[PDB]
mmCIF file of all heavy atoms in Angstrom:
data_model
loop_
_atom_site.group_PDB
_atom_site.id
_atom_site.type_symbol
_atom_site.label_atom_id
_atom_site.label_comp_id
_atom_site.label_asym_id
_atom_site.label_seq_id
_atom_site.Cartn_x
_atom_site.Cartn_y
_atom_site.Cartn_z
ATOM 1 N N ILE A 1 9.144 104.677 -38.676
ATOM 2 C CA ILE A 1 9.034 106.062 -39.131
ATOM 3 C C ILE A 1 9.682 107.071 -38.173
ATOM 4 O O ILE A 1 9.614 108.286 -38.388
ATOM 5 C CB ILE A 1 7.574 106.444 -39.425
ATOM 6 C CG1 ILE A 1 6.709 106.280 -38.166
ATOM 7 C CG2 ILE A 1 7.062 105.630 -40.608
ATOM 8 C CD1 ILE A 1 5.293 106.799 -38.301
ATOM 9 N N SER A 2 10.306 106.549 -37.122
ATOM 10 C CA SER A 2 11.033 107.348 -36.158
ATOM 11 C C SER A 2 10.045 108.147 -35.324
ATOM 12 O O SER A 2 9.363 107.583 -34.479
ATOM 13 C CB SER A 2 12.075 108.240 -36.839
ATOM 14 O OG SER A 2 13.111 108.585 -35.941
ATOM 15 N N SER A 3 9.965 109.449 -35.555
ATOM 16 C CA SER A 3 9.088 110.307 -34.764
ATOM 17 C C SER A 3 8.110 111.092 -35.631
ATOM 18 O O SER A 3 7.432 112.009 -35.156
ATOM 19 C CB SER A 3 9.912 111.251 -33.890
ATOM 20 O OG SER A 3 10.232 110.611 -32.667
ATOM 21 N N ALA A 4 8.046 110.724 -36.906
ATOM 22 C CA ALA A 4 7.252 111.452 -37.875
ATOM 23 C C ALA A 4 5.771 111.048 -37.811
ATOM 24 O O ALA A 4 5.200 110.525 -38.779
ATOM 25 C CB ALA A 4 7.829 111.259 -39.273
ATOM 26 N N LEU A 5 5.145 111.293 -36.667
ATOM 27 C CA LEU A 5 3.719 111.030 -36.547
ATOM 28 C C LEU A 5 2.960 112.254 -36.072
ATOM 29 O O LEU A 5 3.466 113.022 -35.253
ATOM 30 C CB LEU A 5 3.441 109.854 -35.618
ATOM 31 C CG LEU A 5 2.071 109.198 -35.816
ATOM 32 C CD1 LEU A 5 2.112 108.153 -36.915
ATOM 33 C CD2 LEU A 5 1.576 108.590 -34.517
ATOM 34 N N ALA A 6 1.748 112.415 -36.602
ATOM 35 C CA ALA A 6 0.824 113.441 -36.162
ATOM 36 C C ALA A 6 -0.472 112.793 -35.640
ATOM 37 O O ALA A 6 -0.855 111.720 -36.110
ATOM 38 C CB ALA A 6 0.531 114.392 -37.311
ATOM 39 N N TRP A 7 -1.133 113.446 -34.677
ATOM 40 C CA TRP A 7 -2.508 113.089 -34.277
ATOM 41 C C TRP A 7 -3.457 114.227 -34.507
ATOM 42 O O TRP A 7 -3.144 115.386 -34.209
ATOM 43 C CB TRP A 7 -2.592 112.676 -32.813
ATOM 44 C CG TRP A 7 -1.861 111.404 -32.497
ATOM 45 C CD1 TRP A 7 -0.533 111.259 -32.087
ATOM 46 C CD2 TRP A 7 -2.395 110.045 -32.556
ATOM 47 N NE1 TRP A 7 -0.225 109.937 -31.896
ATOM 48 C CE2 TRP A 7 -1.301 109.156 -32.162
ATOM 49 C CE3 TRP A 7 -3.623 109.498 -32.885
ATOM 50 C CZ2 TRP A 7 -1.456 107.791 -32.106
ATOM 51 C CZ3 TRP A 7 -3.768 108.117 -32.825
ATOM 52 C CH2 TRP A 7 -2.708 107.286 -32.445
ATOM 53 N N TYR A 8 -4.631 113.910 -35.041
ATOM 54 C CA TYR A 8 -5.660 114.914 -35.271
ATOM 55 C C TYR A 8 -6.936 114.535 -34.536
ATOM 56 O O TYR A 8 -7.162 113.359 -34.221
ATOM 57 C CB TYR A 8 -5.959 115.056 -36.760
ATOM 58 C CG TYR A 8 -4.754 115.373 -37.613
ATOM 59 C CD1 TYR A 8 -4.016 114.358 -38.214
ATOM 60 C CD2 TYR A 8 -4.350 116.685 -37.823
ATOM 61 C CE1 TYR A 8 -2.912 114.645 -38.996
ATOM 62 C CE2 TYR A 8 -3.242 116.979 -38.608
ATOM 63 C CZ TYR A 8 -2.528 115.953 -39.192
ATOM 64 O OH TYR A 8 -1.430 116.235 -39.970
ATOM 65 N N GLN A 9 -7.770 115.535 -34.265
ATOM 66 C CA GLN A 9 -9.113 115.293 -33.759
ATOM 67 C C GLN A 9 -10.086 115.801 -34.787
ATOM 68 O O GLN A 9 -9.978 116.945 -35.236
ATOM 69 C CB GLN A 9 -9.350 116.030 -32.455
ATOM 70 C CG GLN A 9 -10.783 115.948 -31.973
ATOM 71 C CD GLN A 9 -11.010 116.835 -30.778
ATOM 72 O OE1 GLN A 9 -11.139 118.044 -30.926
ATOM 73 N NE2 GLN A 9 -11.060 116.242 -29.585
ATOM 74 N N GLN A 10 -11.037 114.954 -35.159
ATOM 75 C CA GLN A 10 -12.108 115.368 -36.054
ATOM 76 C C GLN A 10 -13.459 115.240 -35.332
ATOM 77 O O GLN A 10 -13.879 114.139 -34.946
ATOM 78 C CB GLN A 10 -12.081 114.596 -37.387
ATOM 79 C CG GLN A 10 -13.169 115.039 -38.360
ATOM 80 C CD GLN A 10 -13.016 114.529 -39.799
ATOM 81 O OE1 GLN A 10 -12.924 113.318 -40.063
ATOM 82 N NE2 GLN A 10 -12.992 115.469 -40.741
ATOM 83 N N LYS A 11 -14.120 116.387 -35.158
ATOM 84 C CA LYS A 11 -15.547 116.428 -34.870
ATOM 85 C C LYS A 11 -16.237 116.222 -36.216
ATOM 86 O O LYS A 11 -15.827 116.829 -37.202
ATOM 87 C CB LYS A 11 -15.960 117.780 -34.269
ATOM 88 C CG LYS A 11 -15.140 118.275 -33.079
ATOM 89 C CD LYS A 11 -15.265 117.402 -31.834
ATOM 90 C CE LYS A 11 -16.531 117.673 -31.038
ATOM 91 N NZ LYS A 11 -16.433 117.132 -29.652
ATOM 92 N N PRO A 12 -17.282 115.375 -36.273
ATOM 93 C CA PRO A 12 -17.942 115.083 -37.564
ATOM 94 C C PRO A 12 -18.484 116.350 -38.232
ATOM 95 O O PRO A 12 -19.092 117.203 -37.563
ATOM 96 C CB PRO A 12 -19.096 114.148 -37.176
ATOM 97 C CG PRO A 12 -19.286 114.370 -35.707
ATOM 98 C CD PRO A 12 -17.919 114.655 -35.160
ATOM 99 N N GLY A 13 -18.262 116.466 -39.541
ATOM 100 C CA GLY A 13 -18.681 117.652 -40.289
ATOM 101 C C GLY A 13 -17.548 118.642 -40.478
ATOM 102 O O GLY A 13 -17.241 119.028 -41.604
ATOM 103 N N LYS A 14 -16.935 119.046 -39.365
ATOM 104 C CA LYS A 14 -15.756 119.912 -39.359
ATOM 105 C C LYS A 14 -14.459 119.194 -39.797
ATOM 106 O O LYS A 14 -14.360 117.966 -39.731
ATOM 107 C CB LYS A 14 -15.584 120.528 -37.973
ATOM 108 C CG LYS A 14 -16.539 121.680 -37.663
ATOM 109 C CD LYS A 14 -16.553 122.020 -36.173
ATOM 110 C CE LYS A 14 -15.158 122.311 -35.625
ATOM 111 N NZ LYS A 14 -15.020 121.874 -34.205
ATOM 112 N N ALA A 15 -13.474 119.982 -40.243
ATOM 113 C CA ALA A 15 -12.160 119.472 -40.668
ATOM 114 C C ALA A 15 -11.341 118.984 -39.465
ATOM 115 O O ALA A 15 -11.597 119.403 -38.327
ATOM 116 C CB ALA A 15 -11.395 120.546 -41.431
ATOM 117 N N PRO A 16 -10.351 118.098 -39.702
ATOM 118 C CA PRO A 16 -9.509 117.690 -38.581
ATOM 119 C C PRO A 16 -8.683 118.844 -37.984
ATOM 120 O O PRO A 16 -8.198 119.717 -38.704
ATOM 121 C CB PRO A 16 -8.605 116.604 -39.196
ATOM 122 C CG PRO A 16 -9.317 116.155 -40.434
ATOM 123 C CD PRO A 16 -9.944 117.421 -40.947
ATOM 124 N N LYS A 17 -8.539 118.821 -36.664
ATOM 125 C CA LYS A 17 -7.754 119.788 -35.914
ATOM 126 C C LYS A 17 -6.484 119.026 -35.487
ATOM 127 O O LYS A 17 -6.588 117.909 -34.981
ATOM 128 C CB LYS A 17 -8.604 120.290 -34.724
ATOM 129 C CG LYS A 17 -7.906 121.154 -33.672
ATOM 130 C CD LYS A 17 -8.706 121.208 -32.363
ATOM 131 C CE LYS A 17 -7.896 121.768 -31.187
ATOM 132 N NZ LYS A 17 -8.472 121.476 -29.834
ATOM 133 N N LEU A 18 -5.302 119.610 -35.685
ATOM 134 C CA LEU A 18 -4.030 118.971 -35.285
ATOM 135 C C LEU A 18 -3.771 119.023 -33.778
ATOM 136 O O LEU A 18 -3.674 120.112 -33.199
ATOM 137 C CB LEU A 18 -2.835 119.592 -36.026
ATOM 138 C CG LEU A 18 -1.406 119.341 -35.508
ATOM 139 C CD1 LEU A 18 -0.812 118.049 -36.065
ATOM 140 C CD2 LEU A 18 -0.503 120.511 -35.849
ATOM 141 N N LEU A 19 -3.663 117.843 -33.156
ATOM 142 C CA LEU A 19 -3.390 117.723 -31.716
ATOM 143 C C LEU A 19 -1.893 117.665 -31.390
ATOM 144 O O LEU A 19 -1.394 118.427 -30.553
ATOM 145 C CB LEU A 19 -4.060 116.472 -31.141
ATOM 146 C CG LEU A 19 -5.580 116.306 -31.074
ATOM 147 C CD1 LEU A 19 -5.874 114.858 -30.750
ATOM 148 C CD2 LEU A 19 -6.234 117.233 -30.051
ATOM 149 N N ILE A 20 -1.193 116.750 -32.064
ATOM 150 C CA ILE A 20 0.192 116.393 -31.747
ATOM 151 C C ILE A 20 1.004 116.156 -33.022
ATOM 152 O O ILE A 20 0.570 115.441 -33.926
ATOM 153 C CB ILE A 20 0.237 115.143 -30.823
ATOM 154 C CG1 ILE A 20 -0.052 115.565 -29.388
ATOM 155 C CG2 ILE A 20 1.578 114.410 -30.893
ATOM 156 C CD1 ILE A 20 -0.773 114.517 -28.579
ATOM 157 N N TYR A 21 2.182 116.766 -33.076
ATOM 158 C CA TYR A 21 3.138 116.530 -34.141
ATOM 159 C C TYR A 21 4.453 116.048 -33.535
ATOM 160 O O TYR A 21 4.711 116.251 -32.338
ATOM 161 C CB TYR A 21 3.360 117.808 -34.950
ATOM 162 C CG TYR A 21 3.932 118.930 -34.132
ATOM 163 C CD1 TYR A 21 5.311 119.127 -34.059
ATOM 164 C CD2 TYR A 21 3.102 119.796 -33.429
ATOM 165 C CE1 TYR A 21 5.846 120.156 -33.307
ATOM 166 C CE2 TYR A 21 3.628 120.826 -32.676
ATOM 167 C CZ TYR A 21 5.000 120.998 -32.622
ATOM 168 O OH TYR A 21 5.526 122.015 -31.881
ATOM 169 N N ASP A 22 5.278 115.410 -34.367
ATOM 170 C CA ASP A 22 6.540 114.794 -33.934
ATOM 171 C C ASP A 22 6.361 113.773 -32.793
ATOM 172 O O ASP A 22 7.155 113.713 -31.849
ATOM 173 C CB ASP A 22 7.595 115.867 -33.622
ATOM 174 C CG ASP A 22 8.116 116.541 -34.877
ATOM 175 O OD1 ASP A 22 7.875 116.011 -35.980
ATOM 176 O OD2 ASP A 22 8.766 117.596 -34.773
ATOM 177 N N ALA A 23 5.295 112.978 -32.917
ATOM 178 C CA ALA A 23 4.917 111.927 -31.970
ATOM 179 C C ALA A 23 4.412 112.422 -30.622
ATOM 180 O O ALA A 23 3.494 111.817 -30.061
ATOM 181 C CB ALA A 23 6.038 110.918 -31.785
ATOM 182 N N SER A 24 4.999 113.504 -30.104
ATOM 183 C CA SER A 24 4.737 113.930 -28.715
ATOM 184 C C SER A 24 4.667 115.437 -28.426
ATOM 185 O O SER A 24 4.342 115.823 -27.302
ATOM 186 C CB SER A 24 5.761 113.306 -27.773
ATOM 187 O OG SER A 24 7.026 113.917 -27.914
ATOM 188 N N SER A 25 4.959 116.287 -29.404
ATOM 189 C CA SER A 25 4.841 117.718 -29.161
ATOM 190 C C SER A 25 3.399 118.147 -29.280
ATOM 191 O O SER A 25 2.745 117.838 -30.281
ATOM 192 C CB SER A 25 5.689 118.523 -30.136
ATOM 193 O OG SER A 25 7.021 118.077 -30.099
ATOM 194 N N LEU A 26 2.910 118.855 -28.261
ATOM 195 C CA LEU A 26 1.575 119.464 -28.302
ATOM 196 C C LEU A 26 1.527 120.669 -29.225
ATOM 197 O O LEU A 26 2.454 121.483 -29.229
ATOM 198 C CB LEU A 26 1.128 119.896 -26.911
ATOM 199 C CG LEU A 26 -0.088 119.211 -26.293
ATOM 200 C CD1 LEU A 26 0.237 117.759 -25.977
ATOM 201 C CD2 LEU A 26 -0.508 119.965 -25.037
ATOM 202 N N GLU A 27 0.448 120.783 -30.003
ATOM 203 C CA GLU A 27 0.191 122.015 -30.748
ATOM 204 C C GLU A 27 -0.296 123.055 -29.753
ATOM 205 O O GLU A 27 -0.994 122.734 -28.793
ATOM 206 C CB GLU A 27 -0.813 121.819 -31.900
ATOM 207 C CG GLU A 27 -1.229 123.097 -32.642
ATOM 208 C CD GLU A 27 -0.077 123.830 -33.324
ATOM 209 O OE1 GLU A 27 0.882 124.267 -32.649
ATOM 210 O OE2 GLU A 27 -0.103 123.992 -34.559
ATOM 211 N N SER A 28 0.084 124.302 -30.002
ATOM 212 C CA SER A 28 -0.374 125.452 -29.236
ATOM 213 C C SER A 28 -1.897 125.433 -29.132
ATOM 214 O O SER A 28 -2.588 125.204 -30.128
ATOM 215 C CB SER A 28 0.089 126.725 -29.937
ATOM 216 O OG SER A 28 0.007 127.830 -29.078
ATOM 217 N N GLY A 29 -2.416 125.675 -27.931
ATOM 218 C CA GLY A 29 -3.860 125.729 -27.711
ATOM 219 C C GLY A 29 -4.547 124.409 -27.409
ATOM 220 O O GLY A 29 -5.769 124.363 -27.243
ATOM 221 N N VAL A 30 -3.774 123.332 -27.337
ATOM 222 C CA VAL A 30 -4.342 122.030 -27.032
ATOM 223 C C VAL A 30 -4.204 121.771 -25.539
ATOM 224 O O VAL A 30 -3.116 121.939 -24.985
ATOM 225 C CB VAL A 30 -3.678 120.893 -27.846
ATOM 226 C CG1 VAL A 30 -4.179 119.522 -27.392
ATOM 227 C CG2 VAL A 30 -3.940 121.084 -29.331
ATOM 228 N N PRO A 31 -5.310 121.362 -24.888
ATOM 229 C CA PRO A 31 -5.320 121.062 -23.455
ATOM 230 C C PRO A 31 -4.399 119.904 -23.104
ATOM 231 O O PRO A 31 -4.282 118.945 -23.873
ATOM 232 C CB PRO A 31 -6.777 120.673 -23.185
ATOM 233 C CG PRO A 31 -7.554 121.246 -24.323
ATOM 234 C CD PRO A 31 -6.638 121.162 -25.500
ATOM 235 N N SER A 32 -3.758 120.009 -21.942
ATOM 236 C CA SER A 32 -2.632 119.143 -21.561
ATOM 237 C C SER A 32 -2.955 117.673 -21.292
ATOM 238 O O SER A 32 -2.045 116.846 -21.231
ATOM 239 C CB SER A 32 -1.834 119.757 -20.396
ATOM 240 O OG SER A 32 -2.660 120.135 -19.313
ATOM 241 N N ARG A 33 -4.236 117.351 -21.134
ATOM 242 C CA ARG A 33 -4.667 115.952 -20.962
ATOM 243 C C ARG A 33 -4.356 115.081 -22.183
ATOM 244 O O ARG A 33 -4.154 113.875 -22.055
ATOM 245 C CB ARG A 33 -6.157 115.869 -20.615
ATOM 246 C CG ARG A 33 -7.086 116.537 -21.616
ATOM 247 C CD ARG A 33 -8.525 116.347 -21.190
ATOM 248 N NE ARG A 33 -9.486 116.719 -22.223
ATOM 249 C CZ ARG A 33 -9.779 117.969 -22.563
ATOM 250 N NH1 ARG A 33 -9.188 118.991 -21.957
ATOM 251 N NH2 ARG A 33 -10.667 118.200 -23.514
ATOM 252 N N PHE A 34 -4.324 115.718 -23.354
ATOM 253 C CA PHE A 34 -3.834 115.114 -24.584
ATOM 254 C C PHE A 34 -2.315 115.043 -24.569
ATOM 255 O O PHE A 34 -1.649 116.065 -24.355
ATOM 256 C CB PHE A 34 -4.287 115.942 -25.783
ATOM 257 C CG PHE A 34 -5.768 115.939 -25.977
ATOM 258 C CD1 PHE A 34 -6.544 116.988 -25.499
ATOM 259 C CD2 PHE A 34 -6.391 114.885 -26.638
ATOM 260 C CE1 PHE A 34 -7.916 116.987 -25.677
ATOM 261 C CE2 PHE A 34 -7.761 114.877 -26.819
ATOM 262 C CZ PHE A 34 -8.525 115.930 -26.338
ATOM 263 N N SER A 35 -1.776 113.842 -24.795
ATOM 264 C CA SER A 35 -0.326 113.623 -24.821
ATOM 265 C C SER A 35 0.066 112.523 -25.798
ATOM 266 O O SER A 35 -0.665 111.550 -25.975
ATOM 267 C CB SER A 35 0.221 113.311 -23.425
ATOM 268 O OG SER A 35 -0.306 112.095 -22.918
ATOM 269 N N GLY A 36 1.226 112.691 -26.427
ATOM 270 C CA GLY A 36 1.740 111.715 -27.373
ATOM 271 C C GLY A 36 2.988 111.012 -26.883
ATOM 272 O O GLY A 36 3.812 111.594 -26.180
ATOM 273 N N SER A 37 3.128 109.748 -27.254
ATOM 274 C CA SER A 37 4.339 109.006 -26.960
ATOM 275 C C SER A 37 4.551 107.954 -28.033
ATOM 276 O O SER A 37 3.658 107.702 -28.851
ATOM 277 C CB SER A 37 4.273 108.367 -25.567
ATOM 278 O OG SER A 37 3.350 107.295 -25.531
ATOM 279 N N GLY A 38 5.734 107.346 -28.025
ATOM 280 C CA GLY A 38 6.068 106.318 -28.993
ATOM 281 C C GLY A 38 7.149 106.772 -29.945
ATOM 282 O O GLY A 38 7.396 107.969 -30.110
ATOM 283 N N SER A 39 7.793 105.798 -30.571
ATOM 284 C CA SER A 39 8.886 106.049 -31.488
ATOM 285 C C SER A 39 9.072 104.835 -32.388
ATOM 286 O O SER A 39 8.959 103.688 -31.927
ATOM 287 C CB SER A 39 10.163 106.316 -30.697
ATOM 288 O OG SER A 39 11.292 105.906 -31.436
ATOM 289 N N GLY A 40 9.355 105.089 -33.667
ATOM 290 C CA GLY A 40 9.676 104.021 -34.617
ATOM 291 C C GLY A 40 8.468 103.300 -35.189
ATOM 292 O O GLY A 40 8.076 103.541 -36.337
ATOM 293 N N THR A 41 7.866 102.410 -34.403
ATOM 294 C CA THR A 41 6.786 101.596 -34.951
ATOM 295 C C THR A 41 5.447 101.639 -34.207
ATOM 296 O O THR A 41 4.399 101.614 -34.848
ATOM 297 C CB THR A 41 7.263 100.151 -35.245
ATOM 298 O OG1 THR A 41 6.921 99.813 -36.593
ATOM 299 C CG2 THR A 41 6.700 99.105 -34.254
ATOM 300 N N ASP A 42 5.485 101.704 -32.876
ATOM 301 C CA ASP A 42 4.267 101.730 -32.053
ATOM 302 C C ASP A 42 4.113 103.084 -31.375
ATOM 303 O O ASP A 42 5.021 103.537 -30.676
ATOM 304 C CB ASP A 42 4.282 100.614 -30.995
ATOM 305 C CG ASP A 42 4.582 99.230 -31.581
ATOM 306 O OD1 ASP A 42 3.961 98.837 -32.586
ATOM 307 O OD2 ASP A 42 5.449 98.523 -31.028
ATOM 308 N N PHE A 43 2.961 103.722 -31.584
ATOM 309 C CA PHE A 43 2.669 105.066 -31.045
ATOM 310 C C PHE A 43 1.395 105.103 -30.196
ATOM 311 O O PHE A 43 0.479 104.321 -30.418
ATOM 312 C CB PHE A 43 2.584 106.074 -32.199
ATOM 313 C CG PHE A 43 3.870 106.198 -32.984
ATOM 314 C CD1 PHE A 43 4.124 105.366 -34.080
ATOM 315 C CD2 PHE A 43 4.834 107.149 -32.630
ATOM 316 C CE1 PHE A 43 5.308 105.478 -34.804
ATOM 317 C CE2 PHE A 43 6.017 107.265 -33.350
ATOM 318 C CZ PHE A 43 6.255 106.427 -34.439
ATOM 319 N N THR A 44 1.335 106.007 -29.224
ATOM 320 C CA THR A 44 0.135 106.136 -28.392
ATOM 321 C C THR A 44 -0.362 107.585 -28.285
ATOM 322 O O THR A 44 0.416 108.500 -27.988
ATOM 323 C CB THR A 44 0.365 105.588 -26.961
ATOM 324 O OG1 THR A 44 0.860 104.248 -27.021
ATOM 325 C CG2 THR A 44 -0.932 105.591 -26.149
#
């Protein structure tokens, strides 16, 4: 899928909050300890 991955965080009850888009770009307002990596098939 190349770099077309998103990560979300869901606290139970509340809707998911977007952490990371494009495999590794941080969404504005997300603390820097959260980080994305990977490309194509395996993502972290």
Side-chain angles (χ1 to χ4, degrees):
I1 59 173
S2 204
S3 273
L5 201 86
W7 294 91
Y8 304 93
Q9 173 187 78
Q10 182 168 56
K11 309 295 280 197
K14 283 166 55 213
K17 171 198 166 197
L18 164 86
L19 294 167
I20 280 148
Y21 62 92
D22 288 346
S24 73
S25 306
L26 244 68
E27 175 61 299
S28 196
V30 173
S32 51
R33 56 178 192 286
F34 294 98
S35 64
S37 71
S39 151
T41 232
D42 309 311
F43 299 89
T44 306

